[model samples]
Target: MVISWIPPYNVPVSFENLEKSFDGYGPADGLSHIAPQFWVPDGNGGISYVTRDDYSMDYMNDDSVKVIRDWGNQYGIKTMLCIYNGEHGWDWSLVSTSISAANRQSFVDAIVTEMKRLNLHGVEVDLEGPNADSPTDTENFLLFMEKLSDTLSSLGKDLTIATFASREWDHIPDASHWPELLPLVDGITSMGYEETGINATGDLSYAGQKSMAAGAPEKLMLGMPDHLDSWQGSSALQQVEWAQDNGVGVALWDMQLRNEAWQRRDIWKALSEIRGPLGTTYT
Candidate 1:
């Protein structure tokens, strides 16, 4: 299946661009889904922005949600509302940050509570760091996920975690004490595209599979980017093509940058060509 992301949380309130596209057309080679950008709470009662505000919600009004609903009904595609918690730093302590805690629960509660929240099939957690940083921090992150997972599970919603790609889970040092973070959630998202300065390049799908294979294959999805000529110089189509060829479901990062790739029909065509053994293509 092909799963692509939507634009940044903050698109013009008009949402003219997003409404016109995003909904894939026809019986796409298989199936596809959309993930809208979302952000978590910063310690100071705000949200971090790689670029735009996290909670912009391009289309928050009932009319906008109806547009999403109509598109989903027309294309049979599901949309997952992504939750972006503070990342890469300890500036926002998971426990001390009221906004972080409340934001997490609030997003979870809203998804479960809103009957008219169209196109939202599940939730994806984009929590980075706490990656063997400290025993206490690692434990705290897991505890947070456990609580969130329980809450989402009760609502019959999907819980997916996006993890950094590492050679060995134990490489993170504290990872040994952490046990398996993959199996704890409904699904594990392995980020497979990073340029490691040592001439290592291209899609890192193979490495991601190795990291997650020890857990459930069905529950393991791979993370890719719709990166159109970033420093890494990879294209969105290339990322999606790699995922399909490698035999794993794909999760595109940071919905805000989606417009750059979605306009290219060739990319969607490439995504449609994915065919291989369930999880063995990486071999």
Candidate 2:
């Protein structure tokens, strides 16, 4: 799936560019899904629901959730809500508290409800802030994953996680847990944003090798930073080629809509350059 994580920015004006990228004939038409970085924990295992002017789209000004949900369907793109666990990047305590004790059921139930309530494609977990590994925390995460993965799968929805790159990037989930952690979810996305510039070429190969060795090569989705200003077509195309050759998929870290020059380029061609040509069926 040529996934793009739409960060929490430019809600009102985003659709204009979103349409341009997501339209049937637009540059990023083949982009399979869009996961809007919107949800935050309510401290009680529920999503903190609040209305923002930029995010609210329905008549009640309920939040941009409905707006993106509707637009994704119109453009034939799957809409998935991204859930962040920390106040900043990622806080182990924040996530740890939510999934701890018997709250696991609430965490899973609340997240899954968003999928069914809005007919969303799924949810993507972005809790990559812990600076080190914790056996106790990892165990809790594993239990949460099993519950979440099975629940979402049964509902015909996806549950993906943005993992720390296995390269010399930063702290990642324990390698020992990868064998169990990798398969519980639908896709494993590498935080390839760090491996940019001269090093962009090796991002996929290195990340892919680590994930492939663990198992479930089919679920691997190599992540790349899709910044328009610094977007390197050559570098990105090379990564796409690697994914194509390996029969895996690609996930761009974000979507930058305001950059018309960047948008006008053959962005769609690069993303769909794979052998299958952006072919990932949504169940």
Candidate 3:
């Protein structure tokens, strides 16, 4: 399956583009899933919270949320709310502090409650932190995932995680935790583009292979960025071909970037080819 992300700030523009292409790329884009960028807490040692958009905003009252979900249902695409612990920005400490023993269960419950209330198919946990900083942070992250996975399984929902790509085997966050977390998560997507300081295509392919070696091939999805310096049209197509060859999946970073590149068709063409015969309806 091909999965892509839509950040809340760009929801209006992204949804507008999706609607314009709904009749064509809607079912032909191979985009089986779309994750709207939203944030939830790690439950470190304080009360957890969710930030679907602006700190003052509420997704329940947002028309963009309804539009995206309605369009998803219309196209048979699943929607997952991406829950990151970054408050206002990428604060690893927020994640570390939130998943403490004093706050794990409540954090899990907050996620469950939001998913059920929003009628979402699942959630993608995007908590990030330094590898060597604190072992306790990683420990609590695993515990939170285990509990969250069990709860989501009981509810018959999906659970996925966003992981950082590492050339080393003992990388922090996922490498050490994958063996234990793999069985609990539906899938894991690696961020092989930004911050890796490697060729996006080659790095993503390597990461995909690495994940397959660590777990099952089907459980990994290689990430493709829309950055101008990285995964432009041609590079994205290469990533797609790599994923198909490796028996894995691909995930595009943000829908806004794709929309910005609408004048180019190479990326869209690649996605359509993987989606298969377009006339077939998806359920």
Candidate 4:
């Protein structure tokens, strides 16, 4: 199955662009799913402030969600909406650096409100704070997810968590930390796009996926960036090819840049060729 992640920045055309790009292409007749991410609140109302990440809800209108919902209705593509971790971004003002139970509740509240407002098929938690050393913080993070999952289930929505890659499960033990989260969340996302441009390594996506497999549960989606500063077309498509070949689900990161390239028919055409045809199940 194919799934693509998209940043919320590409509001107007983000959903449209992606739908057109893989409409009837690739395995499963285009992506079995499409995920657009980084949906944040305006912080003026509804839920309490959580993340320092600033995102306006002006685009979260019925029009925006409708456009995507309509597409999904037409293509049977599931959309995963990513909600930023509140502790790190602009939401820092909401609570102290040390995450506490009170702080965690506020984060959960914010997520629930957004899910209700967007009618999202599922939610992806992109928690970037809390290093491997902070056991307390890590525990709290899991707690927050558990609460969020309970809340979502009551509302008939689903949850997914974005996880980082580590060389050793001992150092990170990411797989072990989320015993409850693994079952709570519908799926786990493995981010694999840190190997280009600024901190160029080899193909970090591949390495990240490997690391994810090592520490990850069975139900997982591989999230990849759309741009690498050196690649010609969508970095997401590259990921789709890799995920398909490797027998895994695919998710693309950032719709803003990726959609820009997708606007170019030639680029998208090339991507289509690489993706092959629908029902092209990976395994």
Candidate 5:
């Protein structure tokens, strides 16, 4: 599946760009799913915010939820709620270490309840705070994902995780427990772009393959960033081709950047060409 992320900024603007991209290029570009960003923890065993809006239990009735639901239905795109434990960029070490087991269960329960209520297809766990400094944190994260995956599986939903890419494979702070954590999730989306530039894509993809060596390759989704410092035309195409050749999928970072990348480069065409047919089951 070619999954794209929607950031918290400019909700309507991002959606408009995504709609235009889908309309202009159609699904042959391999777009299958969209994940809306920033579902942060509330410190009360519930979600604090989603996208750019603060949400309570009444989020099911929120206008943004309605818009996403309708938009997904209208475009035949699956939706996954991207859950983060970060305020700015992943600082919820407490949830992965200090929180009590009961509290962790409460957090998992809250996520499953909201996902079902929102009518979402799955949840993407973007837990990126703890590291080897807190060795127990990795164990705790595994336990949390184990429970969350079971709960989501019982509900016939999916569990995807976002991991980091690094040259030091064994020391990736964001996903220190990835090898153990891989089996618990439905898919693993690894961030392939770093400040180092497009050359990092190959390293990222290699790191993901190595991390997921024991798991199914199809469950691996290499992330392609649309940032100015990242790959655009042939570079992005090369990464997509690499993913395809390696039996994995691709996850485009944000819709707005993706639209810009499309206008400036034929990245979508590369995806389309690699994707080939319009109707094919990816996972």
Candidate 6:
């Protein structure tokens, strides 16, 4: 299956653009799931989601957020909320503080509350941290996830994570944590766009192989870029086709309907080739 993201990219408004693509575009409607970038950690285990004032985009408000999810529902797509650590500037405190033991219940409560309030099927955690995360932070992050995942599972909501591409980055959720981490979250999205096929810092292929080696292939979702290039010797469309042929899943970076680069037919067609998600190729 394919799950695409809808970020707050400030795209131009038109019937074919942000205004109606969710309800009109084939690629948008074809997705198995769609995650709109809207929520953020409230720093106390609760959430502080997007407001129309924070972004110039029309869909940044509460009402629009509901409409977007409802639109996804109309298309028979599951809606997952993208709650991040304000990835801009690599701010880690938003997640670091929210994932603490002190904030665990509050955070889970907030997530469950928001899910019910917004009619969401699940959430994706995009918490980016320091160049090298401390051991204490890493341990605490796991504990928080364990608790949050249990709560979401009981409510029938799913959880996915945006992990650092590979151990190439000195970050948390690296190779060492996969055995324990992979089983907890429903999906792992490798944010490997930084790998521009220029260096050995493995991109889509590297991340996918590393993750599958450590965990279950069905749980892996290789990352794709709409604006960025892939690793050396591989194209973005090739990456999508790889995911299809491998029996895994694929997720696009930011689904901006107005961007021509994101409108490629081959890429979407490759996504459609996935007869099933949860990787059935090997297992």
Clashes of each: 1, 1, 6, 16, 0, 4
**TM-score to true structure, per model:** 0.62, 0.79, 0.79, 0.65, 0.79, 0.83
For model 1, the superposed segments whose C-alpha errors exceed 4 Å read 7-31, 42-66, 86-91, 94-119, 130-132, 167-179, 192-205, 229-239, 254-266, 273-283
Error of 1 at 25 (Å): 6.6
Task: Write the residue-wise lDDT of candidate 1 on 1-283 in tens digits.
Answer: 4444444455463244434433462122323555554344444433333334354444544455455445554555555655454433423354334324445455345544442254366665554544335555555566566766677677676666666655454322122322356555665656554431112333234443533455455454555554443323545565555555555555545344445564455554554455221221111
lDDT by residue for model 2 (1-283), tens: 6677666655554555566743333423646678877777775788754334454333222346677667666656678867876435566666777778668789888888876777788888876644655667777778888999998888788777777655443364523445777778777776654353323354344444445435776566666665544433445556565666665667776665444433544555655554234433332
Task: Locate the minimum summed-lDDT window of 10 residues in model 6.
Answer: 14-23
lDDT of 3 by residue, 1-283 (tens): 6777776565565566565443354323567677777555654543244454463354434365556666777666667767775566556766665677777777787778877777887878877664533567667778888998999999888898877665354344645566766898887777765443224344344553455336675776677676543443344456566667666666677676654343255656666565444234543
Per residue, candidate 5 scores C-alpha lDDT tens digits across 1-283 of: 6777767665555567655543346332456667777477766567746543443223323467657656766655667877776555556654553234657888888888888877888898876653333556656667778888888888888788887755354333344445676678777776655322224444443544544434565776777776543453345556666766666677777676643444433566656555455443332
Compute the lDDT of residue 117 as modeled in candidate 1.
53
Candidate 1: residue pairs that collide: 8-256
Model 4, range 53-164, lDDT digits (tens) per residue? Answer: 3542455455655566556655555555665534344342222232356566666776666666767676766655333435665666667677878988887776777665
How much lDDT does candidate 6 score?
0.66
Alpha carbon lDDT of each predicted model = 0.47, 0.63, 0.63, 0.51, 0.62, 0.66
Single out the weakest 10-residue window by summed lDDT for candidate 4: 44-53
Among these predictions, the greatest TM-score belongs to 6
Say which candidate scores most in lDDT: 6
Worst 10 residues of 2 by lDDT: 274-283
Off by over 4 Å in 3: 20-23, 26-28, 42-63, 131-133, 167-172, 194-208, 211-213, 229-234, 258-266, 272-283
Q: Write the per-residue lDDT of candidate 6 for residues 31-126, one digit (tens) a residue.
A: 676777777887877787654454645666667677667666655566787787663545778778888878877887887788778888887877
What C-alpha lDDT, on a 0 to 100 scale, does residue 263 get in candidate 1?
49
Off by over 4 Å in 2: 21-28, 50-63, 167-177, 196-214, 228-234, 257-265, 273-283
